[PDB]
Amino acid sequence: HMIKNCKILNLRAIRDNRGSLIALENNKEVPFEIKRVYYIFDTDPNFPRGAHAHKNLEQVLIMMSGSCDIILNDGKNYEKICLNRPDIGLYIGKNMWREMKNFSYGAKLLVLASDFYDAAAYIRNYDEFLRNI
Amino acid sequence: IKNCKILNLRAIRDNRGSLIALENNKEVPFEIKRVYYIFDTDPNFPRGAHAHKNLEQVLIMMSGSCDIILNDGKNYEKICLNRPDIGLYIGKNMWREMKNFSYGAKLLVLASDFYDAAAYIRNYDEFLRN
Ligand SMILES: Cc1cn([C@H]2C[C@H](O)[C@@H](COP(=O)(O)OP(=O)(O)O)O2)c(=O)[nH]c1=O
Ligand SMILES: Cc1cn([C@H]2C[C@H](O)[C@@H](COP(=O)(O)OP(=O)(O)O)O2)c(=O)[nH]c1=O
């Protein structure tokens, strides 16, 4: 796989008989400062999300339940990645096009974001994404 | 009670699902320095009760349910968390006991500070004093 700005984070759970606990801290497990946490639930494999990019926004994606595929695209290379467990995090860094699909029904995705929500930061035209690479 | 509030989180719902977002000093009254989550839970194995002096937290039941018994020194309250569009803000100086997790429930915690092993106040009388 040749995509530069992403990384699989095989996170460390602490397990005991009460359950499993995973923790992520700014500039530690997450290579940025958390400004925003959001989560998506009530998902459906017939209803993918839209492809778009961001410029400066970084994220870490954790499948809290169920599964999905993320197609990542750096302008050059693309890679499909299945998220299907809550102890794996997908770092998506700067200048990445991505598209999330095949959510198992009712799957839940947790996202840690480096910056606040801004609809203007979504790049929906692929050619515009290329140009700014 | 005291330093604690049920947050009705606003969700965006469309045919792809529902999204809820929480942002530093907006939905959450602090800078989120840490996020953790607990899963693989079991109604037989409650968490130990304890307090924190300065840590603030927002809890969100991502799946399933649990009971949080809050104690401010004077009073106590049970809160059943059971839906993902509700958060529980737990402010400073609060004793809490989490219990009664439905099997495999999952709880998301947003925290105002980095994890500190010796910031747990695990003795109630000791809590009362300070
Ligand atoms: C990521 C995010 C999305 N949203 C909104 C924008 C959308 O209506 C909805 C779903 O987000 P998203 O699927 O990211 O964008 P779009 O639907 O425009 O492709 O949630 C927020 O309100 N806050 C956020 O932090
Ligand atoms: C909350 C938290 C706990 N942990 C660890 C410490 C504990 O061994 C385990 C469970 O924590 P927790 O239940 O808060 O403490 P205790 O087990 O002492 O009641 O997870 C972290 O590593 N980081 C964290 O942010």
The run of helices and strands of chain A is EEEEEEEEEEEH
CATH 2nd-level architecture of chain A: Sandwich
From the N-terminal CA to the C-terminal CA of chain A, the straight-line distance is 19 Å
CATH topology of chain A: Jelly Rolls
Sheet/helix structural class of chain A = mainly beta
Placed side by side, the strands forming the largest sheet of chain A appear as: 1-9-6-11-4
Task: Name the helicity range of chain A.
Answer: under 10%
Write down the oligomeric state: homodimer
| Count of the separate structural domains of chain A | 1
Notes on the structure:
Chain B: This is Sugar 3,4-ketoisomerase QdtA cupin domain-containing protein. Chain B: It comes from Campylobacter jejuni. Chain B: InterPro entries: QdtA_cupin_dom (IPR008894), RmlC-like_jellyroll (IPR014710), RmlC_Cupin_sf (IPR011051). Chain B: Pfam families: FdtA (PF05523). It is classed as isomerase. Chain A has about 130 residues and is mainly β. Chain A has a single domain, classed as Sandwich (Jelly Rolls). In chain A, the strands form 3 sheets. A 5-stranded antiparallel sheet of chain A has the order 1-9-6-11-4, with no helix packed on it. The first copy, chain A, is globular, with a radius of gyration of 15 Å. Chain A starts with 5 loop residues before the first strand and ends with a helix. The first copy, chain A, contains 1 helix and 11 strands; from the N terminus they run E-E-E-E-E-E-E-E-E-E-E-H. Strand 4 of chain A pairs antiparallel with strand 3 of chain B. One thymidine-5'-diphosphate sits at the interface of chains B and A.
